[PDB]
Design an enzyme around this catalytic site. Structure first.
Site, PDB file in Angstrom:
ATOM      1  N   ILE B  24      47.872  36.552 -66.889  1.00  0.00           N
ATOM      2  CA  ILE B  24      49.205  36.199 -66.468  1.00  0.00           C
ATOM      3  C   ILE B  24      49.214  34.723 -66.146  1.00  0.00           C
ATOM      4  O   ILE B  24      50.266  34.128 -65.935  1.00  0.00           O
ATOM      5  CB  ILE B  24      49.639  37.032 -65.244  1.00  0.00           C
ATOM      6  CG1 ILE B  24      48.620  36.886 -64.108  1.00  0.00           C
ATOM      7  CG2 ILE B  24      49.804  38.500 -65.660  1.00  0.00           C
ATOM      8  CD1 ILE B  24      49.100  37.455 -62.784  1.00  0.00           C
ATOM      9  N   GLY B  27      45.433  27.924 -65.883  1.00  0.00           N
ATOM     10  CA  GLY B  27      45.617  26.516 -65.581  1.00  0.00           C
ATOM     11  C   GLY B  27      44.314  25.767 -65.348  1.00  0.00           C
ATOM     12  O   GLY B  27      43.307  26.009 -66.023  1.00  0.00           O
ATOM     13  N   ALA B  28      44.340  24.844 -64.392  1.00  0.00           N
ATOM     14  CA  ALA B  28      43.164  24.050 -64.052  1.00  0.00           C
ATOM     15  C   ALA B  28      42.246  24.893 -63.181  1.00  0.00           C
ATOM     16  O   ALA B  28      41.027  24.904 -63.369  1.00  0.00           O
ATOM     17  CB  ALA B  28      43.578  22.782 -63.305  1.00  0.00           C
ATOM     18  N   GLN B  29      42.854  25.592 -62.224  1.00  0.00           N
ATOM     19  CA  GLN B  29      42.133  26.470 -61.309  1.00  0.00           C
ATOM     20  C   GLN B  29      41.259  27.416 -62.130  1.00  0.00           C
ATOM     21  O   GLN B  29      40.037  27.453 -61.962  1.00  0.00           O
ATOM     22  CB  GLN B  29      43.131  27.270 -60.461  1.00  0.00           C
ATOM     23  CG  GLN B  29      43.988  26.404 -59.567  1.00  0.00           C
ATOM     24  CD  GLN B  29      43.157  25.683 -58.523  1.00  0.00           C
ATOM     25  OE1 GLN B  29      42.703  26.289 -57.550  1.00  0.00           O
ATOM     26  NE2 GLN B  29      42.931  24.385 -58.732  1.00  0.00           N
ATOM     27  N   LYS B  47      41.311  36.281 -60.307  1.00  0.00           N
ATOM     28  CA  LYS B  47      41.196  34.894 -60.739  1.00  0.00           C
ATOM     29  C   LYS B  47      39.729  34.543 -60.980  1.00  0.00           C
ATOM     30  O   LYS B  47      38.909  34.647 -60.072  1.00  0.00           O
ATOM     31  CB  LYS B  47      41.780  33.999 -59.639  1.00  0.00           C
ATOM     32  CG  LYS B  47      41.778  32.490 -59.888  1.00  0.00           C
ATOM     33  CD  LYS B  47      42.488  31.798 -58.727  1.00  0.00           C
ATOM     34  CE  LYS B  47      42.792  30.349 -59.026  1.00  0.00           C
ATOM     35  NZ  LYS B  47      41.546  29.627 -59.366  1.00  0.00           N
ATOM     36  N   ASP B 143      53.082  20.461 -52.084  1.00  0.00           N
ATOM     37  CA  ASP B 143      53.506  20.796 -53.438  1.00  0.00           C
ATOM     38  C   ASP B 143      54.201  22.152 -53.522  1.00  0.00           C
ATOM     39  O   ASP B 143      53.967  22.930 -54.447  1.00  0.00           O
ATOM     40  CB  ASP B 143      52.289  20.772 -54.367  1.00  0.00           C
ATOM     41  CG  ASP B 143      52.668  20.816 -55.845  1.00  0.00           C
ATOM     42  OD1 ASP B 143      53.669  20.159 -56.229  1.00  0.00           O
ATOM     43  OD2 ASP B 143      51.949  21.497 -56.621  1.00  0.00           O
TER      44      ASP B 143
END
Lengths: 10, 321
Positions: B24, B27-29, B47, B143
């Site tokens: 889902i 990204g960078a993480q 994750k 952010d």
């Protein structure tokens, strides 16, 4: 004041 | 004990309790999978950190997320459910998997929906509580945005990550910030719910800056002085921008009930303040009469949370279960 029990995401 | 599922070009080796994995995120993480937790019998989010330690840069972020996710604990913040590694030893240690709560959607669409003041001020109430706990933990997001706030069909809301158009001036510019830096974002998100579209659309950090000034009006000279030499020249070279009244910016043609529509505006009028020193604080926002109705001390004021060497630190963190 009662807290909302639903939110329509669709 | 574990098993492997192939998702995209990466291999997710996770505990057998987790099934029905589906990507889902990415990204960078790292890569995030939606998965069904067969023990807790609920949907979670797995994750897998990408290159936990392939450079001192990544490791600190990984060590950062793990430690924070551990101590941090509030209902209005993504809850950790597990952290595990498919590797049997520190020698072979290579992958870090973080399981967390899985929500239904972010505020990207629900914001463009129709929320009554109850749902409107309640979701915001819950944002203020999560952000406040974050703050009381020395974490100042900076952010926050629609794709950063996640919600559930039962109208509950949580903050997705600890962060670092929705940025505050202090941030768009190379200026110093405080905790109320995140109130600007709340001010932006709240306002966009009422508008139906992003408040200050900027094609680039400079245009962005112009939209805001033109809209809210140019700040007082005491603030301008606090501005970098180059950027101060830029602003002093434009026409006099007086902004508009929040009645014009936020007309009753958007609200449903005479009291509440004015209160929401009055609140917006104290969150969308260029000069961070004249901007409302979370405590004050939580006490505002538009938000204060849901106030609860157990929520609004819950007690705070708390080289190749990085491989061990992380491993040690993960091994503490």
């Amino acid at each position: 004041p009662k807290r909302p029990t639903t939110l329509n995401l669709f | 004990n574990f098993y492997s599922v192939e998702i995209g070009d990466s291999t997710f080796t996770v505990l057998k309790r987790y099934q029905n994995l589906k990507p889902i995120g990415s990204g960078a993480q790292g890569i995030v999978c939606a998965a069904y937790d067969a023990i807790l019998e609920r949907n979670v989010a797995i994750k897998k950190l990408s290159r936990p330690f392939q450079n001192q840069t990544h490791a600190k972020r990984a060590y950062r997320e793990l430690v924070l996710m551990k101590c941090v604990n509030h209902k209005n913040i993504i809850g950790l459910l597990n952290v595990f590694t498919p590797q049997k030893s520190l020698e072979e240690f290579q992958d870090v998997y973080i399981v967390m709560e899985l929500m239904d959607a972010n505020l990207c669409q629900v914001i463009q929906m129709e929320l009554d003041h109850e749902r409107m001020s309640y979701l915001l109430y819950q944002m203020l509580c999560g952000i406040k706990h974050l703050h009381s933990a020395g974490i100042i997001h900076r952010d926050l945005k629609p794709s950063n706030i996640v919600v559930k069909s039962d109208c509950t809301l949580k903050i997705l990550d600890f962060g670092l158009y929705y940025r505050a001036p202090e941030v768009i510019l190379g200026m110093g910030y405080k905790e109320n830096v995140d109130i600007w974002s709340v001010g932006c998100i709240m306002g966009e719910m009422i508008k139906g579209g992003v408040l200050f659309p900027g094609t680039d950090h400079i245009d962005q800056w112009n939209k805001v000034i033109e809209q809210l009006g140019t700040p007082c000279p005491e603030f301008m002085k606090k501005l970098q030499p180059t950027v101060r020249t830029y602003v002093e070279n434009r026409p006099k921008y007086a902004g508009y009244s929040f009645e014009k910016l936020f007309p009753d043609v958007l609200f449903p009930n005479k009291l509440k529509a004015s209160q929401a505006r009055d609140l917006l009028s104290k969150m969308l303040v260029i000069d961070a020193s004249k901007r409302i604080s979370v405590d004050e926002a939580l006490q505002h009469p538009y938000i204060n109705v849901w106030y609860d001390p157990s929520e609004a004021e819950a007690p705070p949370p708390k080289i190749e060497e990085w491989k061990e630190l992380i491993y040690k963190e993960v091994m503490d279960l």
